[PDB]
Amino acid sequence: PEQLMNTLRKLRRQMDIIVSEVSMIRDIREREIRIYTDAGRICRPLLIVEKQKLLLKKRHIDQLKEREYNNYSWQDLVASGVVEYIDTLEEETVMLAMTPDDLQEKEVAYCSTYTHCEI
Amino acid sequence: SSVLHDEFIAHRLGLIPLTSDDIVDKLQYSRDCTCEEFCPECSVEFTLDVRCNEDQTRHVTSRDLISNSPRVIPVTSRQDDILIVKLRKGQELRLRAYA
Amino acid sequence: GNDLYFVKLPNFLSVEPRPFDPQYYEDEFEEEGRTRLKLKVENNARIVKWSDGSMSLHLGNEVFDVYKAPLQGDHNHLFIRQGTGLQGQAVFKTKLTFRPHSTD
Amino acid sequence: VLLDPADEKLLEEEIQRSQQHAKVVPWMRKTEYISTEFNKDRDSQITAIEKTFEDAQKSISQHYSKPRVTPVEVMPVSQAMIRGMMDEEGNQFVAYFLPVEETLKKRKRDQEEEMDYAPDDVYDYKIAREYNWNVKNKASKGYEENYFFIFREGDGVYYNELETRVRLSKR
Amino acid sequence: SRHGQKGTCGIQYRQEDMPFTCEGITPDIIINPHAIPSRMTIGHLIECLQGKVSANKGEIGDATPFNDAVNVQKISNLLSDYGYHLRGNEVLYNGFTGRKITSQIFIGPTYYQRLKHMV
Amino acid sequence: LVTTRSMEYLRFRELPAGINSIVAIASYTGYNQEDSVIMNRSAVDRGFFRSVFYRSYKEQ
Amino acid sequence: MIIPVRCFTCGKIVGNKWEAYLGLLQAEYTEGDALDALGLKRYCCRRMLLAHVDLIEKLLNYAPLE
Amino acid sequence: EKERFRKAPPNYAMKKTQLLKEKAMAEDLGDQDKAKQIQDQLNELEERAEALDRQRTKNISAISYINQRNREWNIVESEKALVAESHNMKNQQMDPFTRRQCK
Ligand SMILES: [Zn+2]
Ligand SMILES: [Zn+2]
C-alpha cells in the first residue's frame, strides 16, 4: 500500500486518471485504503508539502500574478501537483502545517513531517 | 428619472451650501413671513432642469442649480461643483427648489 | 539546433504531422458544423518567444499561449523513429520533458 | 534678457514638510472602486491552409490580449519517445549520465526486440551484444500514446509527432 | 458593529451637544464603555484604533485575523506619528459646558451597521 | 476602513453594508448605557445611516 | 451609492471632491496624498473619500432607454 | 408591420438579439445560414460594444483607468513593502503577539 498511495496521489497531482475530487485515505493501523469518489464530500484545497519545502514556489506565484495576461489559473496550480483538495476523512491522515515560515522552519522540530500546509 | 429616488435628490440639494453671506440677514424666516407662498423676501427660488441627451454620463452638479438671485448661489459656483447625480442617456431631472 | 521544441496540442488543434501538400489533402468534412471544418483548415505552426518569458503557439493570426510546463513523470526520449533499419533509427534529438497545452 | 534659475529662485522670499501618508506598511494597503468591466468547399480550404503559412512569416509586434509585450525570437517546428520511470531513473541516452557521449557504445540502434513487435523494440546504447542495460522498450505507448515532437529543422515547416508513448524498463 | 456589539439608538444629540476633540470632531456614535469589559470584543477596540490610523494614513488597514504583521503596538506606533495619542484616546470637551472631560475618551472610526430591526 | 483580505472575494467593497463612523466609547449622558448608542443628530441630518425601505404589493 | 454631499461627522463639503480625488489618484498620487491635496485634514473627512464606494456608476450601467 | 421597416437589434436588449442570433445559428444545420448568422452576430456585437464604450466613453473610462492602474500600483506598493519587511527591529519585545513553537 506504499506504492498505491504514492501512485494514486501522483495521479491526482496530474489530474489524469483520478479527478481532483477523489480522496484516497490510507488507514495505517488498520490495513485499509478507502477511496471515495462520490458526491457530497466537503473538501478544501491545501498546499502540498514535500520533504519540508512547499511545492508552491516563486514560479507559480509569478505566473499566477500575470494571470489572465498569460491565462494561467488556479486550475494550473491544481494540475501542477501544487495544491490538492483534501477532504475531512483524508484530513484524518494529513500532517498539516499552518504556514511555512512558522511550522516548517528549523526550530527544534515539532514533527518535520508535514504533508500539507494551510493556504 | 435618475437612479436616485426623489427624497435622495431632495436631501442632496438640502446639503448644498449657498453663498448667503449677506442676504441671510435680510430674509425673514418663512415661518414668520406673511405671504401665502414663498416670496423673494423670505426665500430664494432655485431651478434645476437637466436631461442627459448624450452618451457620456452627464454629471448634474450645483452648477446646474439656477438661482433667481445672483447673490444666493451655491458656494462652488463662487475648485469643483458638488455632484447631485450622474445621469445616463435619456434620464432627466427637472425640479424647482426654494432655499 | 538541439533544443526542446515539444508541444502537446489538444484534439481540436491537432496539426498535421506532415507539411501541407496538395496531393495529401482532401475535402471530407463540412455552429454545429463550424467546429468540424476548423480541425483540418486552421491547424506548419510557429511559436513566438515573448519578452516576458512566455510563448504562444500562433497558427497564423491566432495566438495560443504556452508555458513549457514540466512533465518529468513522462520525460520520454523523443527521437526520429523513421522506420529505417529495424524499428527505426530513433535519432536522439530532444528528450520530451513538458506538457505544453495551448489555450486562449 | 538674462534669467538664470539660480536667480529665479532668489526672486521668491520663502517658498522651498513630511510625506508620512506614503509610508510602506505591510499591515496596510490601498483601495478599489467601481469600474464597468471586471471578472463546404475546397477552394476556401486551400487558401485558408495557405494563409497561415504566409502570414506567420510577417512582422509581429503585438500580443493578442494586451499589445504591450514585445516579441524576442521565433521558434519554428514519425517519432517514438521512450518514456522513463522516475524512480528507476532510466538512462537511455548519454545526457542523464556524466559524459556527453557514449563511453561504451557508438550507435544506439533501435533494433527490434523480435518479429512480432515493431513499435516495442529494444532501444539501448550498446554497440556490442554485452555490457549494456537491456532496456526492453515495452509496448506502453499502446495504453500511453502520443504528444507531438518538433525541432529546429533549419527553420523549416515540418513535424515529427510521436507515434506512441512507449516506455522501457530494466529487463 | 462587526464585533457583535449591538444596541438601539438611545438618544440623538446635535453636533453642538456631542463632545468634541481639539478640532471639532464630534463622535457619530457614542457607545457605553460597559459594552466592552464583560464581552472582551477587543477586536472592536483594535478596529477603532487601526481605523483611525487608516483614515489618517489615507489607506485601508488590514484586519485579516491571524496576520502577525499587525499588532496593537505597531498600530499605536503608527497612530502616534499622526499626532494622536498612541492608544487612540483623546481629550474631549463636554458639548454642554465646553469643559474638558477629565478622562480622555477612546474615539476613532469604526465600521457600524444599521440593522433591519427599525423600531 | 479596516477589512479582512477575505472580504475582497466576498465583494464587500462593491456591495458594502455599513458606514465608518467616528465612534467614541464614552459614558457621556447615560442614554447609551445598557447596550445602547448615542447617535449624532447632525450626522443623521447629513444622511448618516439614512436608508430606504421598499415594500412591494402584488395583486392579479 | 453616490458621494455624500457633506462629511457626516463635521460638515465639510466632500461632494465636490470625488471626481477630483479619482483624478488625483489617476495622476498616481498616493491615496493619502490625494486627500492631503484636496484639503481633507480631519480623519472624519478623509474617511468620507477613502470609504466611499461609488455604486452609482454601476447603477448607471442599467438602461431605462438606450 | 412595425418591425418590418424598423430594425430591432440596436435596441437596448442587444444581448437578447445576440441570444436569438445564436439560437438561429444553432438551430440550423445549413452552413450558409450559420455563416450569415455569424456575420450578423459579429456585426451586432461590434455595434453594441461601440455603443457601450461611447456611453462608457466619459467618466466610466476614467474610473476604469483608475481601478486598473490602482491594482498595478498596489502590486508595486506591496512588493516594495515586502522588501521593507526585511528591516530589523520592526517588532517589540513586550509580547504584542505570540505564536506557538512546541517541541
Ligand atoms: Zn415671504
Ligand atoms: Zn469631516
Resolution, rounded to a tenth of an Å?
3.0
Contacts with D33 from chain G: Cβ below 8 Å: 22, 53-54
Shortest Cα distance, chain G CAs vs residue E102, angstroms:
23
Q: Are D146 and D107 in contact (CB under 8 A)?
A: no
Which chain G residue is nearest to residue F43, measuring alpha carbons? Answer: G8
Q: Do H75 and A109 touch (CB under 8 A)?
A: no
Q: Around Cβ A119, how many Cβ atoms within 10 Å?
A: 10
Q: Do A65 and H75 touch (CB under 8 A)?
A: yes
Q: Does F42 touch chain B (CB under 8 A)?
A: no
CA distance A62 to A57: 9
Q: Does D23 touch chain H (CB under 8 A)?
A: no
Query: Which secondary-structure segment (H or E) carries B92?
Result: strand B92-98
DSSP string for residues in F2-43: EE-SHHHHTTTTTS---EEEEEEE--TTSTTTTTEEEEEHHH
Strands A116-117 and B58-61: unpaired
The helix-helix angle for G18-26 and G31-38 (nearest 10°) equals 130
Numbered residues of the known binding site of B: 33, 35, 39, 41-42
Q: Does D20 touch chain F (CB under 8 A)?
A: no
One-letter amino acid at B64 equals D
The boundaries of the domain holding residue B29 are: 1-99
Q: Do E62 and D20 touch (CB under 8 A)?
A: no
For residue C14, count CB atoms less than 10 angstroms from its CB and return exposed for 0-12, middle for 13-18, buried for 19 or more. middle
Query: Which secondary-structure segment (H or E) carries E107?
Result: strand E105-112
Please tell me the distance between residue F41's alpha carbon and the centre of ligand 1 in angstroms: 29
Q: Are E86 and E79 in contact (CB under 8 A)?
A: yes
Please tell me the distance between residue D103's alpha carbon and the centre of ligand 2 in angstroms: 83
**Number of structural domains in chain B:** 1
Q: How many CB pairs under 8 A join F and G?
A: 34
- What is the three-class DSSP state of D80? coil
Please tell me the distance between residue B25's alpha carbon and the centre of ligand 1 in angstroms: 14
Classify each residue of F20-40 as buried b or exposed e, where b means 16 or more C-beta atoms within 10 Å of its C-beta: bbbbbbbbbbebbbeebbbbb
| Dihedral pair phi/psi, residue H14, rounded to 5° | -60, -35
Q: Does F11 touch chain D (CB under 8 A)?
A: no
CA distance G9 to B63: 25
Could you give all domains of chain G from N- to C-terminal order, each with its CATH number? 1-66 (1.10.10.60)
* CB proximity under 8 Å: D 54-73 to A: 65-66
Strand order in the sheet with C55-57: C64-66, C55-57, C46-50, D71-76
Numbered residues of the known binding site of B for Zn(2+): 33, 35, 39, 41-42
Beta bridge partners of E106: E89, F25
Contacts with D65 from chain A: Cβ below 8 Å: 68-69, 71
Identify which ligand lies nearest to the alpha carbon of G35: 2
Classify each residue of C48-62 as buried b or exposed e, where b means 16 or more C-beta atoms within 10 Å of its C-beta: bebeeebbbbbbbeb
Q: Write down how long chain C is.
A: 104
Which chain H residue is nearest to residue A105, measuring alpha carbons? Answer: H101
- What is the three-class DSSP state of B62? helix
Experimental method: cryo-EM
CA distance F36 to E25: 21
Contacts with F18 from chain E: Cβ below 8 Å: 2, 111-114
* CB proximity under 8 Å: A 17-36 to C: none
Among candidate residues F22, B8, E24, the one with its CA nearest the CA of residue G12: E24
Helices (H), D19-128: 43-55
| Grid coordinates given for D47 | 487558401
Which chains touch G (3+ CB pairs under 8 A)? B, D, E, F, H
CA distance E104 to E89: 6
Residue F35 annotated in active site: yes
Q: Do B15 and F50 touch (CB under 8 A)?
A: no
Among candidate residues G48, G41, G35, G37, the one with its CA nearest the CA of residue G9: G48
Q: Does G3 touch chain H (CB under 8 A)?
A: no
* Sign, Cα dihedral of H91, H92, H98, H103: positive
Shortest Cα distance, chain D CAs vs residue H15, angstroms:
16
One-letter amino acid at G12 equals K
- Integer angstrom CA distances of residue A92 from A2, A14, A34, D117: 17, 23, 12, 48
Q: Which of F11, F25, F31, F35 is catalytic?
A: F35
Please tell me the distance between residue B68's alpha carbon and the centre of ligand 1 in angstroms: 14
Q: How many CB pairs under 8 A join D and G?
A: 24
Please tell me the distance between residue E93's alpha carbon and the centre of ligand 2 in angstroms: 17
Nearest by CB to H56, from D32, D34, D36: name it: D36
Q: Do H94 and E73 touch (CB under 8 A)?
A: yes
Strand order in the sheet with B66-67: B66-67, B45-51, B92-98
Count of alpha carbons within 13 angstroms of residue F56, beta-carbon side: 1
Which chain H residue is nearest to residue G18, measuring alpha carbons? Answer: H63
Q: Are D164 and D141 in contact (CB under 8 A)?
A: yes
- What is the three-class DSSP state of H93? coil
CA distance G39 to E18: 25
Q: Does F38 touch chain G (CB under 8 A)?
A: no
- What is the three-class DSSP state of D165? coil
Among candidate residues G3, F49, G26, G10, the one with its CA nearest the CA of residue B82: G3
Nearest by CB to G5, from B1, B12, B88: name it: B12
Q: Are E49 and E75 in contact (CB under 8 A)?
A: yes
Which chain D residue is nearest to residue E55, measuring alpha carbons? Answer: D21
First-to-last C-alpha distance (Å) of chain H: 85
Nearest by CB to H63, from G22, G63, G66: name it: G22
Which chain B residue is nearest to residue G65, measuring alpha carbons? Answer: B90
What CATH number is attached to the domain comprising B46? 2.170.120.12
| Grid coordinates given for G22 | 479619482
Beta bridge partners of A86: A44
For residue B29, the 8-state DSSP code is P
Please tell me the distance between residue H1's alpha carbon and the centre of ligand 1 in angstroms: 58
